[PDB]
Amino acid sequence: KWVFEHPETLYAWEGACVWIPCTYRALDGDLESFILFHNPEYNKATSKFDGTRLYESTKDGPSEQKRVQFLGDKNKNCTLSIHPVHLADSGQLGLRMESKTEKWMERIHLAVSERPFPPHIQLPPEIQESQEVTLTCLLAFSCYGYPIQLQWLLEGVPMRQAAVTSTSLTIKSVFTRSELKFSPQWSHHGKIVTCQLQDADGKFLSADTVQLNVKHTPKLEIKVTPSDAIVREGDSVTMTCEVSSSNPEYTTVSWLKDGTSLKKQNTFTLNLREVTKDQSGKYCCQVSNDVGPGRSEEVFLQVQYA
């Protein structure tokens, strides 16, 4: 029973580095030899592991200027460092360990892409206007030798809101995260948000893009005929209610005169026939969707005597 604790799969790209936190417990006790293979192959005939050796405790254990470094010890630490990492390093890292009475091979998968891979934006399934939402950008990479930055963009412009970067680099998980808190408005709907990955000097590396879907109450434009909203008694007045933006789709419409609802006016058009001076006042329409009700600007109807 050999117990190992490591991220089990590490990601990087050509020219960057990888840092592999690793602890272990050998019930047999202290180690006597350590070999780090790359893509180790097992020889059934000789009962030994063949393949490329990247580190040997007998030979490489040094000059401090070495691409592959073993940073652990013969006890409880198996931390590895490859700086820089190459596409040829991609595959199986085989930690060939031997205790006094037993030998163990612990494999750690290393996935290296030729170019930087994009980050991943995670956002809640329902985003509503005027509620603080945290956008999360997640990159499955973090290495000391290669500092990086995550940059938020809105329609190609750097976003005003401060974003907070945090990095995990543990036996459990390796990532770089950026969280941006902002309250979206109805105008943010349909816009694109970009999370840019940059190196320490701001050089563009990769990016992920999402188009925002922001729920909002209906936004309305009211129009009146005649346009000046001034009529004599007996004339006819027509007011229409137009939905400029609504997410999701609107479901009901109502009309109000001076704060009181006009009964049986449940269409997007209000027709006042043979108007009396009574019907002067302030008019508006209200359109509701699943998010809530919206109201248009008020129209001041002036019915002048005779």
Ligand SMILES: *[C@@H]1O[C@H](CO)[C@@H](O[C@@H]2O[C@H](CO)[C@@H](O[C@@H]3O[C@H](CO[C@H]4O[C@H](CO)[C@@H](O)[C@H](O)[C@@H]4O)[C@@H](O)[C@H](O[C@H]4O[C@H](CO)[C@@H](O)[C@H](O)[C@@H]4O)[C@@H]3O)[C@H](O)[C@H]2NC(C)=O)[C@H](O)[C@H]1NC(C)=O
């Ligand atoms: C197994 O045992 C080993 C040996 O002790 C432990 O190794 C140490 O690991 C820590 C991190 O867990 C290392 O700290 C980090 O080292 C990075 C590499 O720095 C080297 O290169 C720079 C640049 O040339 C040198 O200046 C430096 O002296 C090293 O030679 C740094 O890049 C890191 O910097 C980051 O963190 C520091 C905070 O400490 C910040 O100030 C920085 O801004 C940056 O954010 C950091 O210094 C440490 O160097 C390792 N020690 C050795 C001797 O290698 C393992 O941790 C252990 N494993 C487990 C699982 O316990």
Ligand SMILES: CC(=O)N[C@H]1[C@H]([C@H](O)[C@H](O)CO)O[C@@](OC[C@H]2O[C@@H](O)[C@H](O)[C@@H](O)[C@H]2O)(C(=O)O)C[C@@H]1O
């Ligand atoms: C404690 C113990 O079981 N040691 C085994 C060791 C472990 O099973 C292995 O390191 C765990 O990953 O395997 C040894 O065999 C490796 C060899 O086993 C074949 O069955 C397999 O087809 C090969 O791919 C290869 O894994 C070892 O020496 O490392 C034997 C040892 O007793």
